[model samples]
Target: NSLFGSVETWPWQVLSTGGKEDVSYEERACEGGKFATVEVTDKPVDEALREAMPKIMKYVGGTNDKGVGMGMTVPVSFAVFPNEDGSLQKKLKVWFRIPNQFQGSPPAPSDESVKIEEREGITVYSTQFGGYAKEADYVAHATQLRTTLEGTPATYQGDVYYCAGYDPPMKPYGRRNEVWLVKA
Candidate 1:
């Protein structure tokens, strides 16, 4: 048998998704890899999600030069931005975690707008909710979480909150969504 170990990126690992006192805290460790991301703005969130999904799915569909189907990772996330004109921009930055096999050497996407970006680690405090992840729902949940974290030991790290979706639209039950308070 050969001696040298081969390094591969698979089943990308993250920190503990632990919880206490009704708030779930997870430490997502620095999985040294990049994501295929697209920034879509100036549209409704559902529309934005609809738009971004196919673009990212193209990558997962083996559109790369090597024709690899990146494993559809869980907790698809969206980042929202508020417009300066006193209107909340139904914005979206959709992220797809690249599989381990391609982490170090990911294939190039057919679309120029799709970018491969390396992400950093973060400690996240998450709050779960059911059904569709509407912007109002996220805002309300974020407020509830922020109110709860006040002067607590697990101080929130940023004003921005992350909305993570774990199910597809067709999933009839157990649709999982979480609003995460990134920790320091």
Candidate 2:
């Protein structure tokens, strides 16, 4: 039998992904962590739009038939560092699918469509309630994940959140989703 109950054991623990750990179950499950702080600065909406547009279209749209583009709206990026002592990072990223509108451009990318939006400064934590077959084995895999993200560049236009998963059967996966945080 496979370690994940017939589901092949993906090496890493879902919780080991980089980010502050959350103590409260409620916060960890829903919000990931608390809001720590946000560093806001003036950025050209067009510049951010240009940088993210191609990547978004290529990775998101080109592969998935359902993907679309954001016209003129530019996203603000945040670097969410987890708190010391292993608590969930008070300012991490979250995952979700939503629609977007570009304010300044003539909509060259396409008509209004759904794209991943980074909710600037919003904090999110990974889910941690499920049980797996071999905790020790997963820990070993998680250690490797730490090394992978140690020196990566932080996104300038949005925050990134990492999590673990097993997809396409035999593949062990680590995934990240970016969010745009905006003032209400």
Candidate 3:
């Protein structure tokens, strides 16, 4: 996919579908991994991704200090900040998890917008849905994912929920998309 490059999947496991709500989802634990990330702004989910894609690609497409094509990973993930009234906000943060192979000494991104950083793993109640995602879809699923977490042992600390998208825009059918609650 253009959003992400050819890389191995992140190490993770599905704990369960802890959902007791109408918007059902699975619980998963993602092993901590480093990611090449960038932040973008505004409405319409596609454009936000579009804004950051070039920088991200530049990083993965051999533009770093090492000039190595470190492959790519799935689920071009991101978090959204909404307007006070829950309208679309001015910012979106998107990132691609760098594959484990390149973490030894991750190459530096030529572009300033993209930052490569290490992240500790997390456990989140993740919900899946079909179709290309809009910001509204993620927002709704985020709320439902939080509700799904209500009866679970999972705890929350931050307001930012994560969105994981597995397919590109062209893959019209059986698209896999997910929203993950931010766990404390």
Candidate 4:
């Protein structure tokens, strides 16, 4: 059994890249399509994700109406909603891109909480980080990315940011994670 998911990657194009040693930033234009998503609230982030992940996991694992294993995709993404004080809002929207095989017409999720959303193209200012990510890790990276965006010509939304993880818990070193600010 695999620890995380699959080898397939999400599609994106790099517009630019620059930053310091701690956090390197990129401007990327990302493709959009069908996604298996889960939204959870009223709990700690870790707790909420724990409650949320398995639902979508099952969807991609053939728990959908088609009864076909859609295979997994990389960089599980989370949309974070935080308050002005940098305190998280106890809610997050999880996204797993539907694999290429099922992109045309993905199967319906068997679980109601696991919804399939059709997203349009999006652009983001992103920063890379390494390690197993947590709520604090994502928050800290978002802060760093914000500081780096300062004085730059980039115009981005301040309210929402995305946190992404590309590896499973089994991988110990050089794990990839990122924080993203969507362009306004």
Candidate 5:
């Protein structure tokens, strides 16, 4: 019996040169709905991403409550890709958060040109979504979303990206995930 019901579960899939059977998993939690929590575990670390450890630690450690950067954590799976020589080649992971309760809809694609903003030199485009499940459905919706935004005069950076996924564990109804694309 599946714990999440009949709903399909997409554990992180690492697509690399090595065979798929070599994928590694790690228990992790989402941080800021963007990054994953770094922890020492039995899972092997991808060498390519080892250098990013410092940044991840800083982001996960340097934060306080009252929205003052106090770090929050969630349980997740970390996917690691190893090379033919058994060395770490790449790393990818998925992290999700509770959808925001704000009912106010995202700024309509017509309301304003989707503009890429730079804060402290970080370039990111603000976008939003209402629902999604199954990669195909997500892709279809994302295409329409991209088309709508492309009609505007604003500089189109890329497709919409989301961090939140369906809530209530696996209920077909209720809130869906929202994605934001950050131009880096």
Candidate 6:
């Protein structure tokens, strides 16, 4: 199944919610370990996603050293670097969490475009919304997060943000998406 079929999601602990709404500012401490990553550049955001998704898809589609088809995981996340107009700039980093079966020693990717990444624990300001997310949607959400945090003492990276998708295109209703700002 292309969708996340009872697979593990990247884990996080809620640090704070600021007593706001679902789309309000929230804080999280993210548990990070390994992820399958693809970094694409020099293309439009949508085109980049079109080009990059398949390579990593192939990795979990039995293109690894083990030749095992690891089922999909939740939150096909994008670390988006955007231009002023809400278009993505170069370096659209896409990520998929290494499934629990392979978290300890994930199989090596056969595709050069697919990389095994070890990420450190991170803290972020996060906000979530529903529906399929577009590039502009992410930008707007991130901007709103910044605005919400401006009067507060919190600090976050201004240049880049994260967009996380938690459903497949096949699942039309109750889709989940989030925007994350890395704590500075």
User: Cα-based RMSD of the predictions, in order?
Assistant: 4.7, 18.3, 7.8, 7.8, 18.8, 7.3
Q: Where does candidate 2 stray beyond 4 Å?
A: 1-80, 98-143, 148-160, 164-184
lDDT of 5 by residue, 87-108 (tens): 4334433332211221111111
Backbone clashes counted, model 3 = 3
Off by over 4 Å in 4: 1-11, 20-22, 130-135, 156-159, 166-174
Tell me the tens digit of each residue's lDDT in model 1 across 1-184.
6576676553445645544465444545555467888888777767788898888877767787666666555456776543434234566788776545556677877787687877665556667766655546666666567666666666643345766765465543544567766665
TM-score of 6: 0.77
Go through the candidates in order and give each one's C-alpha lDDT. Answer: 0.65, 0.29, 0.68, 0.73, 0.32, 0.73
- Please write out the lDDT profile of model 6 over residues 37-106, one tens digit for every residue: 8978887677778787787788877878777665656568878776677666667788887657678567
Q: Which structure is stronger by lDDT: 4 or 5? A: 4
Any runs in candidate 5 off by more than 4 Å, and if so which? 1-91, 95-120, 129-135, 152-160, 166-168
Q: Is candidate 3 or candidate 6 better by lDDT?
A: 6
Better of 1 and 6 by lDDT: 6
Query: Which pairs in model 4 have colliding backbones?
Result: none
TM-score of 4: 0.74
How high is each candidate's TM-score?
A: 0.67, 0.20, 0.69, 0.74, 0.31, 0.77
Alpha-carbon shift of residue 148 in model 6 (angstroms): 0.9
Candidates sorted on TM-score, descending: 6, 4, 3, 1, 5, 2
Candidate number with the higher lDDT (1 or 4) = 4
lDDT over C-alpha atoms for residue 55 of model 2: 39
